[PDB]
């Protein structure tokens, strides 16, 4: 009972249909404002790393609202502190994009929309033993936002689609909800190497789909990875679920939320990080 | 005399006109081959840092072959080891570009040319007390190569030209050689933050202009910084010097050299770096 493009179930209705927590005042996405952010030199380079003993397969699903890569358990990790001790475990990666190249991202940077934003979703394994235990609990989640920008001149091997192994060619008009397919694994360490993993915005916010749970540690990298126009078009061939009005999947992004709506009882701060 | 576009003085002649050292077997630029390169996990993230006590002015000149930013002494530094103890001191930054958007860089990455390559030139202050001591001596220099790529959709603030402060507007048809102008300082730390400073090729090579001295420790970052078509055409507004056949400055790049020409007496290796995973 939610959508992006059906005005009966669309993002303007979520605050009424999912008051816990889409009516809250720690919502995502936000406009990432360079001038109205606080630099915190203690925020360290982000590392993504794999358990080389893991052999289980990766899948991708058209879930009717996005293309969602589902990682197997105990395989991909994030470190924010330079220690490789499995504090954050990656669950899934999904995508938000536009009907057109001038929009698509959930977050903006100084009001600018990117054509594609990837969300790498992890749970705080340091505290919570499973995703199902973490997803609804305080401080459960950490999401990385990866901006993508379109370029006319580039070798395949230097695009984000190299790190995605082209989603093993699975993206087409017949990849219909709720189908999933097995795909070659995503090299998330290569993906992170395509941008500056020290240069990012950081804040406490929410899931950007219902029920908009206010338990997400957000990190949004300022530098985009690079893709081609042919590559963004592979996402736009996907069909939306039947609860949507638009036929082809696109404009699957939530509208911008305020950092501090007027009813907040404790203001949050937007932080930024850069290298030593 | 040398040039890029006069066939009498152009790059195919340098090996004869400047045999010391344009006839050498450790020449630059090279094709940076991802597959035929040795990953060395010991090569650390590059840092660029400023002496915040320096107040001296930056200038830029059209030297007849490039646009060259001349930094004041004791101002901008490179660290390859995480220590901020002034081992490498930056002297200047210049640029290589194309008549068209599909060429211009001196290095290639797996055969691919970028529209614009910037060269941040430093000397090994750790060993040599001045640029003029280091520039002609063994192991004297370290150059950073910064690839740039054109995007259609971007804010000024996320382009390389934010770090450059648009070179204070000096890139135009009236910026004739050998004119120099005072410019706002270049934020080289911001520039480096626009790419991944842990992801680079590394090798021992040469200056890419005569006399091609084989005393350069090369670092070429794999990820490009971003510019617009409007910004690349600003460089194309500069006039070449009177040594050149072409009027407008462009195609001011040296042809690709082999890592190991047939006559080499000791093969060099191309190294690659990536972030502590
Ligand atoms: N757009 S975003 O990045 O803000 C974002 C929005 C919304 C979500 C949805 C989170 N749900 C997700 S990621 N779910 C649902 C679930 O109940 N379980 C619990 C069961 C289970 C078991 C193994 C592995 C995974 C799971 C997750 C999957 C995640 C991320
Ligand atoms: N294309 S490249 O990156 O391989 C490359 C090619 C050629 C060079 C030019 C080297 N010359 C350069 S960088 N010169 C010449 C000189 O007489 N002195 C000595 C005096 C002096 C004093 C202060 C500050 C600078 C200097 C340099 C400037 C540098 C770099
Ligand atoms: C830190 C972590 O999750 N390590 C896992 C280990 O528990 C598992 O038994 C193995 C084989 O799948 O892969 C690795
Ligand atoms: C993760 C998931 O839902 N996997 C499904 C599987 O259960 C189903 O049997 C198969 C073919 O329909 O497609 C896939
Ligand atoms: C702020 C600054 O120094 N330089 C300007 C910038 O404001 C302007 O939008 C752009 C295009 O004309 O060129 C540069
Ligand atoms: C990527 O996948 C698409 C199908 O989604 C295919 O048409 C395209 O050629 C693929 N490109 C590769 C493997 O480079
Ligand atoms: C920093 O600048 C000051 C004054 O400009 C100078 O005296 C000092 O030597 C510089 N530091 C270094 C390490 O070069
Ligand atoms: Zn998302
Ligand atoms: Zn140069």
Author numbering:
A (entry chain BBB): 24 to 299
B (entry chain AAA): 24 to 300
Manuscript text:
For structural studies, we sought to complement ligand 35c with SmCA and hCA II in order to observe possible differences in the active site interactions. Initially, we solved the crystal structure of SmCA in the presence of 35c at a resolution of 1.79 Å observing a strong density inside the active site fully compatible with the inhibitor. The binding mode of 35c was the classical of this moiety anchoring the sulphonamide group through the catalytic zinc and displacing the water molecule. In addition, compound 35c formed the characteristic hydrogen bond with residue Thr231, stabilising the interaction. Several hydrophobic interactions are observed for both aromatic ring with side chains Val144 and Leu230 and the terminal portion of inhibitor with Ile114 and Pro154. From a superposition of the two complexes, we found no substantial differences occurring between the two complexes of SmCA and hCA II explaining the similar potency of action against the two different CAs. In addition, crystallographic analysis of the schistosome tegumental enzyme SmCA and human CA II complexed with a selection of these inhibitors showed the hydrophobic tails of the inhibitors is located in the both isoforms in the same hydrophobic task, explaining the lack of selectivity.
